Ligand binder design. Structure first.
Ligand SMILES: Nc1ncnc2c1ncn2[C@@H]1O[C@H](COP(=O)(O)OP(=O)(O)O)[C@@H](O)[C@H]1O
Lengths: 195, 244, 51, 242, 252, 195
């Protein structure tokens, strides 16, 4: 005699917490379940100071920190969500991928599918700002390591047999893309000053 | 020729990376990769080749002899403080009182990675100053031993910048495969345990970087191997006791 | 009750003061640790009680 | 509790040094110095006058310990011994004082190149400096490599666990043909090597290493780039066209 | 016997704990001793002698009388000849240190009694006994396994998951990116100038390329094999164009 | 403006989830909040398939997997459960540490004591089972690795400046009589199958 939460809802919530996101492409059942009962999931996440951000255009759900009033606390802290600041190279790569994803969305309409990109298409972009590591092999190694690090954060996938990687929809929401734009502008201005 | 090249890194741990941060003339974060078939460090005299050897020896030894290659025979000019502060004693021309590169509060990190059959072992050291003082007792030291690939000098520096020694300790608590020692004696004991070699091995490794000033076999033996272990101080105590 | 750390420090200083003697097998590598170890040897030996 | 203990400790240190050399001879036995020769070591003992005076004084002290005079003769003998000790201590780097109070100065040293099958000594440098700048360098480098290999090897093992060693401008007095032998010997001992070379010898190490860390200063900022020799050659080609 | 009394009290506390743990009817010999407000640690040997000693010491009048007489005796000139400074001081302050030691021992006894009373509560003696028995059985049984096989050592056991920590949620907002500042400028400069050898010295490049006598050795050998005739140095130079002049000639 | 779980309760639950366990000896305040409203905390953790196990005697709350009736067992298969099932060597070290903990708890006073043991004490006990590797350094390294794994499980702390570790009270709930009985039965079955 109890009030156990629906098994499917519990599974969806645990999956969402474990992965922080739910893609209709990967887990259609859990995504549909969460869509069917959004109030239940938001109530479940309320005690943990968390919430779900629906995005039906891209078929993506994600966990957003539903903090308290926290007046203008730019340094908000959450016990369960650990904040990370990316590197200079990692931030540059993220900005490049984000702008490419935005361009793909524009050219295929909002909510497109599988915004892909090619490693050879990214190497020159990285070389423009970061410079030349000293060889083609070193350039490829650097790009591959950066892509691996980004995949660890869940922003891109591993290259396929065609040396292509798909930008994941989670790039659409990155808290403060304005910082990414400012970094890109600063990098391009520095390069122009060099030349 | 190449068949023998595969022996290295199989039955032994071979150095395969060095990372520096605000060490000597290496401002910022620098990384050097070392090949498994031997590597050569080359460059015009007066760059950071001796700086690199000294960083590695600082990670390895207890009282490393800095710049032993050129200062062998007499006392060394450089020290740990001058490497952390980035003093430029030698190169002058506009020297602003030794041109201390980092006079204020600063943090310098050094890290060396060793590998064997895919097993990794990272030695590290964070040395920081909180003020403008340059006293040896005013430098805060934190040595690090790791076997987890995710524990890189970059991560340690990020944690330090974010939350000082408090967050460093907290990270050590929740980290898998990390051991932070505030005193270098325990860290060197851990190194001894891991590599199953006494302190004499690493002291000899240090002395090997100053082989240039060599002479007849007698001097090579009495100055390179079989470390001092002299009894010139015990004799003074014996003499004082006999005075009593 | 003497605080443990102070006793360890005193024992370590005494141990360093007699490192030359061969009988004591005092190791100069890290006297403090040895001192602590020695004290613990006498805590489970029941010469002293730790609390 | 003193003097006698100090002398016994010095003698024990000498014994330890001798045993270390003896068991390093076996580690050198496994590698050919010349193509089939192999090299061994001989300790021998110093014959300084200070050591013989110390032996005389110690014999006098032992004889005096048996006299029944309320420790007067014993005190006099101990006084002579301590006077000798203070004499050595004050002049802490005269050869006599070092031989008296330094374990690694009471015994000489010598190398001997032999034959792998014929155990007869073929060339015994019994101190006998008589060598060229390259010869002394060769012997010193070989002995240092053997010592490093022995020291880094865990007890009961012939393969060092810490296989990386660092040399700093090691070879300067030897020809390019004999340095390669040194590198070959270093590899034979199982030691991975990081050499630090001046602008010279960049061609000598190109035959024994597969990569180089180029360290270049751009003012007060040193930078380092880890490149294979081929990539360095491509950089040079770019230079020649710039 | 001040330290002997404390040793006896410690042993009595240990014995009482062991009796409570090893007894199969905990309920009886727990309440029988807890509702009581007696010592519960009445060490029949010295420890009752200490009680009489405390009774005597707490008696007033005699203590101050003896202290005054002791100081009067210490004042005597012959006292300096009899004892020394340390002994004289110790004897003079004998009563003060006696009372201090009595207070310390009484505090230790009260603390030990309170500790044993606290242990008697919480009823963990039965759990301690069962756990010790089970651990002994498991440690004796584990001797039959083969611990030299990684297969055995890495077998997963049925122990439960206690202390499950839910930390590290991705929470895509958790990511922040580098902001323009001096550190970013320095990082960019390091990235650009690493592997930028243009400014490097010319003599470095000149020393980089030199006569690799290894290749020249085989080239000369092949040339002599092709000619298979006695060749002079001038003829060799003509046939083989030396790119380093005397450097080649010495080799030849 | 809407039903908000009391910020004290939310903070206590978040700390408990972040650290897995909550001890009165370190955070008496949050421990007391959790103890005061155990039903609220249980309701909050229910959707996660997590429950709160209490030890008022030791002043220790912890989070454990909540299995409804028969969730295929495999409680270590819970999506939010990181770490891996303890192996045989880890179980043996846990048994040794639990024996030390019981010995300490028998002779335990009334205040916080934080049961401690020197690393050198565990060396012979382990050597009896795992054998002599050849030298003190090898066995010390083996013991340090095992202790690091156990600390990852939260049962110990890293050795301090004196080469001493602290056995956390959570062990008293990992190696408790019921779990020890289950492990003993499993080990007996393994021995029988081996022969
Ligand atoms: N710790 C330091 N103290 C003084 N000068 C330093 C230090 N670290 C770097 N430098 C400067 O950087 C250069 C070090 O040159 P380096 O290549 O390390 O020496 P070497 O040519 O002997 O190998 C010099 O110009 C020196 O002034």
């Amino acid at each position: 005699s109890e009030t156990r939460t629906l098994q499917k809802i519990r599974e969806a919530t645990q999956e969402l917490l474990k992965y922080g996101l739910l893609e209709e492409a990967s887990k259609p059942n859990l995504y549909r379940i969460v869509l069917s009962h959004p109030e239940e999931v938001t109530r479940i996440l309320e005690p943990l100071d968390l919430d779900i951000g629906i995005d039906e255009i891209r078929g993506l759900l994600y966990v957003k920190v539903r903090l308290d009033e926290t007046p203008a606390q730019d340094e908000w802290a959450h016990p369960l969500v650990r904040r990370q600041r990316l590197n200079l190279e990692q931030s540059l790569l993220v900005a490049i991928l984000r702008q490419h994803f935005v361009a793909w969305e524009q050219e295929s309409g909002t909510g497109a599918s599988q915004a892909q990109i090619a490693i050879d298409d990214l190497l020159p972009q990285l070389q423009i700002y970061l410079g030349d590591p000293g060889s083609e092999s070193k350039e490829r190694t650097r790009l591959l390591t950066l892509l691996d690090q980004l995949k660890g954060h869940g922003l891109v996938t591993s290259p396929d047999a065609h040396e292509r990687i798909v930008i994941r929809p989670i790039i659409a929401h990155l808290a403060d893309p304005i910082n990414l734009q400012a970094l890109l502008a600063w990098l391009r201005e520095q390069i122009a000053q060099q030349t | 020729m190449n068949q023998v090249s595969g022996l290295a890194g199989k039955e032994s741990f071979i150095l395969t990376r060095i990372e520096l941060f605000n060490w000597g003339g290496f401002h910022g974060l620098h990384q050097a990769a070392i090949h498994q078939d031997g590597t050569a460090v080359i460059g015009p005299t007066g760059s950071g080749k001796t700086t690199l050897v000294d960083a590695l020896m600082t990670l390895l030894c207890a009282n490393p002899r800095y710049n032993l290659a050129s200062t062998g025979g007499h006392e060394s000019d450089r020290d740990l403080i001058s490497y952390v502060r980035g003093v430029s004693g030698p190169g002058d021309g506009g020297e602003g009182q030794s041109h201390i590169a980092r006079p204020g509060k600063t943090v310098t990190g050094i890290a060396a990675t060793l590998e064997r059959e895919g097993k990794q072992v990272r030695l590290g050291a964070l040395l920081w100053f909180d003020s403008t003082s340059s006293s040896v007792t005013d430098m805060k030291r934190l040595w690090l031993f790791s076997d987890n690939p995710g524990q890189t000098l970059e991560h340690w520096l990020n944690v330090y910048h974010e939350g000082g020694t408090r967050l460093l300790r907290q990270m050590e608590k929740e980290a898998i495969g990390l051991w932070t020692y505030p005193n270098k004696k325990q860290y060197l004991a851990r190194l001894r345990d891991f590599f199953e070699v006494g302190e004499n091995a690493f002291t000899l490794l240090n002395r090997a970087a100053g082989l240039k000033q060599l002479n007849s076999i007698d001097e090579i033996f009495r100055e390179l191997v079989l470390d001092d272990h002299s009894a010139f101080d015990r004799a003074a105590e014996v003499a004082n006791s006999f005075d009593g | 009750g003497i605080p443990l750390e102070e006793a360890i420090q005193s024992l370590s200083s005494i141990l360093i003061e007699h490192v030359s003697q061969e009988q004591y097998d005092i190791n100069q590598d890290n006297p403090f640790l040895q001192a602590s170890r020695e004290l613990r040897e006498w805590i489970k030996r029941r010469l002293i009680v730790e609390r | 509790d003193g003097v006698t203990q100090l002398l016994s400790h010095i003698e024990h240190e000498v014994l330890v040094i001798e045993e270390r050399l003896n068991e390093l001879n076996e580690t050198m036995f496994r590698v050919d110095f010349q193509p089939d020769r192999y090299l061994r070591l001989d300790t021998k003992k110093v014959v300084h006058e200070s050591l013989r005076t110390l032996e005389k004084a110690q014999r006098q002290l032992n004889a005096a310990r048996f006299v029944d005079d309320n420790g007067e003769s014993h005190y006099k003998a101990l006084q002579v011994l301590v006077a000798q000790l203070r004499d050595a201590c004050e002049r802490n780097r005269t050869l006599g004082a070092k031989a008296l109070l330094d374990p690694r100065f009471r015994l000489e040293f010598a190398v001997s190149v032999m034959d792998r099958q014929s155990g007869n000594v073929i060339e015994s440098r019994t101190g006998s400096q008589g060598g060229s700048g390259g010869e002394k360098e060769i012997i010193a480098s070989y002995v240092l490599t053997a010592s490093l290999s022995y020291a880094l090897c865990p007890a009961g093992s012939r393969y060092p666990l810490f296989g990386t060693i660092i040399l700093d401008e090691a070879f300067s007095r030897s020809s390019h043909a004999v340095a390669g032998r040194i590198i070959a010997a270093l590899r034979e001992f199982g030691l991975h090597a990081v050499f630090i070379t001046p602008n010279k010898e960049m061609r000598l190490l190109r035959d024994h290493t597969r990569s180089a860390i180029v360290v270049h200063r751009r003012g007060q900022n040193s930078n380092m780039a880890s490149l294979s020799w081929e990539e360095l050659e491509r950089h040079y080609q770019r230079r020649g066209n710039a | 016997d001040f330290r002997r009394v404390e040793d006896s009290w410690r042993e009595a506390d240990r014995a009482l704990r062991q009796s409570i743990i090893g007894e199969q009817y905990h309920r009886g010999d727990i309440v029988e001793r807890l509702l009581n407000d007696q010592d519960a640690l009445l060490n029949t040997p010295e420890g009752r002698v200490f009680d009489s000693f405390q009774q005597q010491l707490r008696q007033s009048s005699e203590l101050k009388a003896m202290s005054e007489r002791l100081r009067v005796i210490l004042s005597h000139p012959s006292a300096s000849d009899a004892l020394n400074r340390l002994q004289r001081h110790d004897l003079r302050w004998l009563v003060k240190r006696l009372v201090d030691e009595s207070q310390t021992v009484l505090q230790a006894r009260a603390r030990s009694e309170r500790d044993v009373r606290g242990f008697m509560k919480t009823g963990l003696a039965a759990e301690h006994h069962r756990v010790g028995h089970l651990l002994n059985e498991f440690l004796n049984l584990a001797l039959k396994l083969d611990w030299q096989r990684q297969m055995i050592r890495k077998q997963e056991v049925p122990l439960p998951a206690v202390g499950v920590a839910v930390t590290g949620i991705p929470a895509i907002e958790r990511l922040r990116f580098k902001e323009v500042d001096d550190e970013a400028e320095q990082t960019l400069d390091l990235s650009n100038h690493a592997a930028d050898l243009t400014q490097i010295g010319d003599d470095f490049w000149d020393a980089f390329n030199g006569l690799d006598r290894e290749v020249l050795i085989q080239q000369t050998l092949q040339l002599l094999a092709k000619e298979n005739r006695p060749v002079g140095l001038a003829e060799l130079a003509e046939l083989l164009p030396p790119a380093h002049d005397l450097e080649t000639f010495a080799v030849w």
